[PDB]
Coordinates of C-alpha atoms in Angstrom, one line a residue:
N1 CA 128.2 112.6 108.1
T2 CA 131.3 111.3 106.3
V3 CA 131.7 107.8 107.8
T4 CA 135.2 106.2 107.8
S5 CA 136.0 102.5 108.5
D6 CA 139.2 100.6 107.7
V7 CA 139.2 97.4 105.6
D8 CA 141.2 94.2 105.2
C9 CA 141.6 93.1 101.6
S10 CA 142.5 89.7 100.1
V11 CA 143.8 89.6 96.6
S12 CA 143.9 86.4 94.4
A13 CA 145.7 87.0 91.1
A14 CA 146.9 84.7 88.3
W15 CA 144.4 82.0 89.0
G16 CA 145.3 82.0 92.8
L17 CA 149.0 81.5 92.2
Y18 CA 149.6 85.0 93.7
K19 CA 147.6 85.8 96.9
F20 CA 148.3 88.8 99.2
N21 CA 146.8 90.9 102.0
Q22 CA 146.5 94.7 101.9
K23 CA 145.1 97.2 104.4
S24 CA 143.0 100.3 103.6
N25 CA 140.3 102.7 104.4
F26 CA 136.7 102.9 103.1
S27 CA 135.1 106.3 103.5
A28 CA 131.6 107.6 102.5
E29 CA 129.2 110.6 102.8
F30 CA 125.4 109.6 102.9
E31 CA 123.2 112.6 102.4
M32 CA 119.5 111.8 103.0
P33 CA 116.5 113.6 104.6
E34 CA 116.6 113.5 108.4
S35 CA 113.0 112.3 108.4
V36 CA 110.5 110.8 105.9
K37 CA 107.0 109.4 105.6
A38 CA 106.4 105.7 104.8
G39 CA 105.6 105.4 101.1
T40 CA 107.2 108.7 99.9
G41 CA 110.1 108.4 97.5
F42 CA 113.3 110.1 98.5
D43 CA 116.9 110.5 97.3
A44 CA 120.1 109.3 98.8
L45 CA 123.2 110.9 97.5
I46 CA 126.4 108.8 98.1
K47 CA 129.7 110.6 97.9
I48 CA 132.5 108.0 98.0
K49 CA 135.9 109.5 99.0
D50 CA 139.1 108.5 97.1
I51 CA 141.3 105.7 98.4
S52 CA 145.1 105.2 98.1
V53 CA 146.6 101.8 98.3
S54 CA 150.4 101.7 98.7
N55 CA 151.7 98.2 97.8
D56 CA 155.3 98.5 96.4
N57 CA 154.7 96.3 93.3
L58 CA 152.3 98.9 92.0
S59 CA 155.3 101.0 90.8
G60 CA 156.1 97.8 88.8
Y61 CA 152.8 97.6 86.9
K62 CA 152.0 99.1 83.5
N63 CA 148.1 99.1 83.4
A64 CA 145.0 98.7 85.5
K65 CA 141.3 99.0 85.3
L66 CA 138.4 97.4 87.3
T67 CA 136.1 95.0 85.4
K68 CA 133.7 94.3 88.3
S69 CA 133.0 96.1 91.6
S70 CA 130.5 96.0 94.5
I71 CA 129.9 98.2 97.5
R72 CA 127.8 96.1 99.9
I73 CA 125.6 98.1 102.4
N74 CA 123.2 96.6 104.9
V75 CA 120.1 98.8 104.5
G76 CA 117.7 96.6 106.4
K77 CA 114.3 95.1 105.3
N78 CA 112.1 98.2 105.7
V79 CA 113.1 99.7 102.3
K80 CA 112.9 99.2 98.5
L81 CA 114.3 100.8 95.5
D82 CA 112.0 103.3 93.9
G83 CA 112.1 102.5 90.2
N84 CA 114.4 100.2 88.3
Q85 CA 117.9 101.7 88.7
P86 CA 120.7 100.2 86.7
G87 CA 123.9 99.4 88.5
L88 CA 122.0 99.2 91.9
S89 CA 120.6 95.9 93.2
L90 CA 118.6 95.2 96.4
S91 CA 118.3 91.7 97.9
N92 CA 117.7 90.6 101.4
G93 CA 118.4 94.0 103.0
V94 CA 121.7 94.2 101.0
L95 CA 121.9 97.2 98.7
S96 CA 124.7 96.3 96.3
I97 CA 126.2 99.1 94.3
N98 CA 127.8 97.5 91.2
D99 CA 130.4 98.5 88.7
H100 CA 130.7 102.1 90.0
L101 CA 134.4 102.0 91.0
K102 CA 137.2 103.4 88.8
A103 CA 140.9 102.6 89.3
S104 CA 143.6 104.9 88.0
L105 CA 147.2 103.7 88.4
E106 CA 149.6 106.3 89.9
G107 CA 153.2 105.1 90.1
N108 CA 153.6 103.6 93.6
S109 CA 149.9 104.0 94.4
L110 CA 146.5 102.8 93.2
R111 CA 143.8 105.5 93.4
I112 CA 140.2 104.1 93.5
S113 CA 137.5 106.7 92.9
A114 CA 133.7 107.1 92.1
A115 CA 131.4 109.8 90.8
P116 CA 128.6 110.3 93.5
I117 CA 125.8 107.8 93.1
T118 CA 122.1 108.8 93.6
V119 CA 119.8 106.2 94.9
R120 CA 116.1 106.8 95.2
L121 CA 114.4 104.8 97.9
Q122 CA 111.1 104.6 99.7
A123 CA 110.4 103.0 103.1
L124 CA 107.6 100.5 103.5
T125 CA 106.2 101.0 107.0
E126 CA 106.7 103.3 110.0
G127 CA 110.0 102.7 111.8
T128 CA 113.7 103.4 111.3
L129 CA 116.1 102.9 108.5
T130 CA 119.6 102.0 109.6
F131 CA 122.5 101.8 107.2
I132 CA 125.3 99.4 108.3
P133 CA 128.2 98.4 106.2
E134 CA 128.3 94.7 105.3
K135 CA 131.1 92.5 106.6
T136 CA 132.3 92.1 103.0
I137 CA 131.9 95.7 102.2
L138 CA 133.8 95.5 98.9
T139 CA 134.7 93.2 96.1
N140 CA 136.3 94.0 92.7
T141 CA 137.9 92.3 89.8
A142 CA 141.0 94.1 88.3
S143 CA 142.7 93.6 85.1
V144 CA 146.4 94.3 85.7
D145 CA 149.1 93.8 83.0
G146 CA 147.0 91.0 81.4
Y147 CA 146.3 89.2 84.7
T148 CA 143.1 89.1 86.5
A149 CA 143.0 89.9 90.2
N150 CA 140.1 89.3 92.5
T151 CA 139.7 91.4 95.7
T152 CA 137.6 91.0 98.8
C153 CA 137.6 93.6 101.5
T154 CA 136.0 93.0 104.9
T155 CA 135.4 95.6 107.7
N156 CA 134.4 95.6 111.3
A157 CA 132.5 98.9 111.4
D158 CA 129.3 98.7 113.5
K159 CA 128.8 102.4 112.8
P160 CA 125.7 103.3 110.7
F161 CA 126.3 105.9 107.9
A162 CA 123.0 107.6 108.3
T163 CA 119.7 106.9 110.3
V164 CA 116.4 107.9 108.8
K165 CA 113.1 108.2 110.9
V166 CA 110.1 106.8 109.0
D167 CA 107.0 108.6 110.2
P168 CA 103.8 106.9 109.2
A169 CA 101.9 107.6 106.0
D170 CA 98.8 109.8 106.1
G171 CA 95.8 107.9 107.7
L172 CA 92.0 108.3 108.0
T173 CA 90.7 111.3 109.8
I174 CA 87.3 111.8 111.4
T175 CA 85.6 115.2 112.1
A176 CA 82.8 115.3 114.7
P177 CA 81.7 118.1 117.0
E178 CA 83.3 118.9 120.0
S179 CA 80.3 117.8 121.9
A180 CA 76.6 116.8 121.3
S181 CA 73.3 116.3 123.1
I182 CA 71.0 113.3 122.9
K183 CA 68.1 113.4 120.4
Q184 CA 70.0 115.6 117.8
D185 CA 71.7 115.1 114.5
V186 CA 75.4 114.7 114.7
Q187 CA 77.3 114.9 111.4
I188 CA 80.4 112.7 111.1
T189 CA 82.9 112.9 108.3
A190 CA 85.7 110.5 107.5
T191 CA 88.5 111.3 105.0
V192 CA 90.6 108.8 103.2
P193 CA 94.1 109.5 101.8
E194 CA 94.3 109.9 98.1
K195 CA 96.7 107.1 98.1
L196 CA 94.6 104.4 99.7
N197 CA 91.7 105.3 97.4
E198 CA 93.6 105.4 94.1
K199 CA 91.1 103.3 92.3
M200 CA 88.3 105.7 93.6
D201 CA 85.8 102.9 94.5
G202 CA 86.0 102.4 98.2
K203 CA 83.6 102.7 101.2
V204 CA 83.8 103.6 104.9
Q205 CA 82.0 101.6 107.5
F206 CA 81.3 103.6 110.6
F207 CA 80.9 102.2 114.1
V208 CA 79.6 103.7 117.3
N209 CA 81.0 102.2 120.5
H210 CA 82.2 99.4 118.2
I211 CA 78.9 98.4 116.7
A212 CA 78.4 98.8 113.0
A213 CA 76.3 101.9 112.3
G214 CA 74.5 101.5 109.1
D215 CA 75.7 100.3 105.7
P216 CA 79.2 101.1 104.6
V217 CA 79.2 104.7 103.1
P218 CA 80.6 105.0 99.7
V219 CA 83.6 107.4 99.5
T220 CA 83.1 110.6 97.4
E221 CA 85.1 112.0 94.6
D222 CA 86.9 114.2 97.2
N223 CA 88.0 111.2 99.4
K224 CA 85.4 111.9 102.0
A225 CA 82.6 109.9 103.7
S226 CA 79.7 111.1 105.9
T227 CA 76.9 109.8 108.0
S228 CA 74.6 111.3 110.6
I229 CA 74.1 109.7 114.0
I230 CA 71.4 110.5 116.6
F231 CA 72.6 109.5 120.1
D232 CA 70.3 107.9 122.7
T233 CA 72.2 108.3 125.9
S234 CA 75.0 110.4 127.3
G235 CA 78.7 109.2 127.4
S236 CA 82.1 109.4 125.8
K237 CA 81.1 107.9 122.5
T238 CA 83.8 106.1 120.4
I239 CA 83.3 106.7 116.6
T240 CA 85.3 104.5 114.3
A241 CA 85.8 104.8 110.5
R242 CA 87.0 101.7 108.7
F243 CA 88.1 101.9 105.1
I244 CA 87.1 99.2 102.6
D245 CA 88.5 98.9 99.1
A246 CA 87.0 97.6 95.8
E247 CA 87.3 94.0 97.0
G248 CA 86.5 94.6 100.7
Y249 CA 90.0 94.5 102.3
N250 CA 90.9 96.9 105.1
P251 CA 94.4 98.0 104.0
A252 CA 94.7 101.0 106.3
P253 CA 94.3 101.4 110.1
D254 CA 90.9 102.6 111.4
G255 CA 90.3 106.2 112.3
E256 CA 88.8 106.7 115.8
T257 CA 87.5 109.7 117.6
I258 CA 85.5 110.3 120.8
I259 CA 82.4 112.7 121.1
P260 CA 81.3 113.6 124.6
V261 CA 77.5 113.4 124.6
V262 CA 75.4 115.1 127.2
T263 CA 71.7 114.8 128.2
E264 CA 71.5 118.5 127.6
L265 CA 73.8 121.5 127.5
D266 CA 72.0 124.5 129.1
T267 CA 74.1 127.4 127.9
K268 CA 73.6 130.8 129.5
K269 CA 70.7 132.8 127.9
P270 CA 71.7 135.3 125.3
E271 CA 70.8 138.2 127.6
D272 CA 73.0 136.7 130.3
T273 CA 75.9 138.9 129.7
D274 CA 78.2 137.3 132.3
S275 CA 80.1 134.1 132.2
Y276 CA 80.7 131.1 134.5
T277 CA 83.2 128.5 135.7
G278 CA 83.6 125.7 138.2
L279 CA 85.5 123.0 139.9
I280 CA 84.9 119.4 140.8
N281 CA 87.2 117.8 143.5
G282 CA 89.2 121.0 143.3
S283 CA 89.6 120.8 139.5
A284 CA 88.1 122.4 136.4
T285 CA 87.3 119.4 134.3
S286 CA 85.9 119.5 130.7
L287 CA 83.4 117.3 129.0
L288 CA 86.3 116.0 127.1
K289 CA 88.3 115.2 130.2
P290 CA 85.5 114.4 132.7
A291 CA 86.3 113.5 136.3
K292 CA 86.4 109.7 136.7
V293 CA 83.9 109.0 139.5
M294 CA 82.3 105.8 140.7
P295 CA 78.7 105.5 142.0
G296 CA 78.6 105.6 145.8
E297 CA 81.1 108.4 145.9
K298 CA 81.0 111.9 147.6
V299 CA 82.2 114.8 145.4
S300 CA 82.9 118.4 146.0
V301 CA 81.7 121.0 143.5
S302 CA 82.4 124.7 143.1
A303 CA 80.4 127.1 140.9
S304 CA 81.5 130.7 140.2
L305 CA 79.8 133.6 138.5
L306 CA 82.3 135.9 136.8
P307 CA 80.7 139.3 136.4
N308 CA 81.4 141.1 133.1
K309 CA 80.6 144.4 134.6
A310 CA 80.1 146.0 138.0
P311 CA 78.0 146.8 139.8
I312 CA 75.5 144.2 138.8
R313 CA 72.4 143.1 140.7
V314 CA 72.7 139.5 141.8
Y315 CA 70.0 138.0 144.0
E316 CA 70.3 134.2 144.2
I317 CA 73.0 131.7 143.3
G318 CA 73.2 127.9 144.0
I319 CA 74.3 124.5 142.7
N320 CA 71.7 122.4 141.0
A321 CA 73.1 118.8 140.9
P322 CA 71.8 116.2 138.4
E323 CA 68.6 114.1 139.1
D324 CA 69.1 111.6 142.0
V325 CA 72.4 113.3 143.1
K326 CA 71.7 114.3 146.7
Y327 CA 72.8 117.5 148.5
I328 CA 74.9 117.0 151.7
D329 CA 73.5 119.2 154.6
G330 CA 75.3 122.2 155.8
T331 CA 78.1 122.0 153.3
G332 CA 76.9 124.9 151.0
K333 CA 79.1 127.9 151.5
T334 CA 79.3 131.1 149.6
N335 CA 82.3 133.3 148.7
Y336 CA 80.7 135.8 151.0
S337 CA 78.1 136.4 153.8
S338 CA 74.8 134.7 153.1
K339 CA 71.6 133.0 154.2
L340 CA 69.8 130.0 152.5
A341 CA 66.5 131.1 151.0
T342 CA 65.8 128.3 148.7
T343 CA 65.6 124.5 149.1
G344 CA 64.4 122.7 146.0
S345 CA 62.3 125.1 143.9
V346 CA 60.5 126.3 147.0
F347 CA 61.4 129.8 148.2
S348 CA 60.7 131.0 151.7
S349 CA 61.6 134.4 153.1
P350 CA 64.6 134.4 155.5
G351 CA 63.8 138.0 156.4
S352 CA 62.2 141.1 154.9
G353 CA 63.8 142.4 151.8
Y354 CA 64.6 139.0 150.1
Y355 CA 63.3 138.6 146.5
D356 CA 61.4 135.4 145.4
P357 CA 62.8 133.8 142.3
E358 CA 59.4 132.1 141.7
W359 CA 61.1 129.0 140.3
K360 CA 57.6 127.7 140.6
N361 CA 56.6 129.7 137.5
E362 CA 59.7 128.8 135.4
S363 CA 59.5 126.1 132.8
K364 CA 62.8 124.6 134.1
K365 CA 62.9 124.4 137.9
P366 CA 65.7 123.3 140.3
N367 CA 65.5 119.8 141.7
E368 CA 65.7 118.5 145.3
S369 CA 69.5 119.0 145.5
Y370 CA 69.4 122.7 144.7
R371 CA 70.3 125.1 147.5
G372 CA 69.9 128.9 146.8
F373 CA 71.6 131.6 148.7
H374 CA 71.1 135.3 149.1
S375 CA 73.6 137.9 150.5
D376 CA 72.6 139.3 153.9
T377 CA 74.4 142.6 153.2
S378 CA 73.4 143.7 149.7
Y379 CA 72.2 142.3 146.3
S380 CA 74.7 144.6 144.5
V381 CA 78.0 143.1 143.6
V382 CA 80.7 145.8 144.0
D383 CA 83.3 144.4 141.7
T384 CA 84.2 141.8 139.1
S385 CA 85.5 139.2 141.5
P386 CA 84.1 135.6 141.2
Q387 CA 80.8 135.1 143.1
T388 CA 81.3 131.4 144.2
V389 CA 79.0 128.8 145.7
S390 CA 80.4 125.4 146.7
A391 CA 79.0 122.3 148.3
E392 CA 79.5 118.5 148.5
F393 CA 77.2 115.9 146.9
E394 CA 76.6 112.2 147.0
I395 CA 76.3 110.1 143.8
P396 CA 73.9 107.1 144.4
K397 CA 75.4 103.7 143.8
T398 CA 72.6 103.2 141.2
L399 CA 73.2 106.3 139.2
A400 CA 73.3 105.3 135.5
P401 CA 76.5 105.3 133.3
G402 CA 77.0 108.5 131.2
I403 CA 78.3 112.0 131.4
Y404 CA 76.9 114.4 134.0
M405 CA 77.4 118.0 134.7
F406 CA 76.5 120.4 137.6
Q407 CA 74.4 123.5 137.1
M408 CA 74.3 127.0 138.6
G409 CA 70.9 128.3 139.5
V410 CA 71.0 132.1 139.1
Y411 CA 68.5 134.9 139.5
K412 CA 69.9 138.4 138.8
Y413 CA 69.6 141.8 137.1
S414 CA 67.0 144.6 137.4
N415 CA 65.6 143.0 134.2
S416 CA 65.0 139.8 136.1
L417 CA 66.8 136.8 134.7
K418 CA 66.3 133.3 136.0
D419 CA 68.5 130.4 134.6
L420 CA 70.1 127.0 135.1
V421 CA 73.5 127.0 133.6
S422 CA 75.4 123.8 132.9
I423 CA 79.1 124.2 133.9
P424 CA 81.2 121.9 131.8
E425 CA 84.1 122.5 134.2
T426 CA 82.1 120.3 136.7
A427 CA 81.6 117.4 134.2
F428 CA 82.1 113.9 135.6
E429 CA 81.6 110.5 134.0
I430 CA 80.2 107.3 135.3
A431 CA 81.8 104.5 133.3
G432 CA 79.7 102.0 131.4
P433 CA 80.8 98.6 130.2
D434 CA 84.0 98.0 128.2
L435 CA 83.3 98.4 124.5
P436 CA 83.0 95.1 122.6
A437 CA 86.0 94.1 120.5
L438 CA 86.0 95.3 116.9
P439 CA 85.7 92.7 114.1
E440 CA 89.2 91.9 112.9
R441 CA 90.5 94.0 110.0
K442 CA 90.8 92.1 106.7
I443 CA 94.4 92.6 105.6
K444 CA 95.4 91.5 102.1
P445 CA 97.8 88.5 101.7

């Protein structure tokens, strides 16, 4: 990263009575971090390489020293000097390195040299620092044989010495579950960088879907802030933390996060020793990436039971859609050979040797969309291959906005287990209205 660029020098000496041109090369090594954070001090080491100038009248001179000098570098407007640093000045994106050049006379030649200069900088905002040489890269004043010579060297180098990526400074974070159900406490924690909260007297105003949620929470001694939110309805909820300082300015960006919220999550019972998966429109979704579906739409769902162990006894499987979502007739297939024993929560025998789930007795029953299937061959499952049921459903055009999930109805084991299992891989979401705009941040002037 030693960047070379040739220069054109004008000399005025003896009060302008003796002007001449001179060509030369300016060459410098800029060692800086490849990358930094906005706001973090860093060093720039500048090695300037020696220059020879070979005018023939130099052999004729008896003494020389520089009395002034300047290296002019275009460092842009995204940087400042970190600490008063003598010799160095910064004005209008011009870093001016002053009085650092030494000039030793050497017969026929003039050797201009410099001890490496260290410059501590810090960038202001996220972006890039680009170091360009200035057109007038170099001026100096020389005292030769009792005369004063003024020099101005211009260059045409477009080529940056170094580039530095400015990554942003640390920002607010927010910690929420994962996922949540309605009617339950959800803890939310914001954290504020040490650096925004230096004076240790700030607050964090939370928002839920862009509405203010409670009074601003005062930040703790450990730069944290917490609230507790109880959700009313399902949906991808946007949580926003806004930081406020001693005199309510919002100097930092807001932190945002999203919590998927469900009506309920019906996990497999503890004694259910298997596990489950599914698909919706041929894909395993997640309640964090729910399928985007509009009301009025027909979807296809698959639900699989993945045995932990074989053989297990497995009697009835089926897909229990959400309330109002209607089953499409004759679409329910199994992985295997089967007859349909159960419509709704009503069982009726499709032959002798078929066991009744008695969903009637259970506290949670399947709804009108549920279709339950028994194997005609055997109730034993020979291996650990997925036991899959799949069908197509219709979403009514009036189904409410929120996050929805399909369930698997299952009745199994010698020790008779009956359960409805929410399969997050089948999650879809009916979009609500666009959030309202957030109140504007109050930036300091």
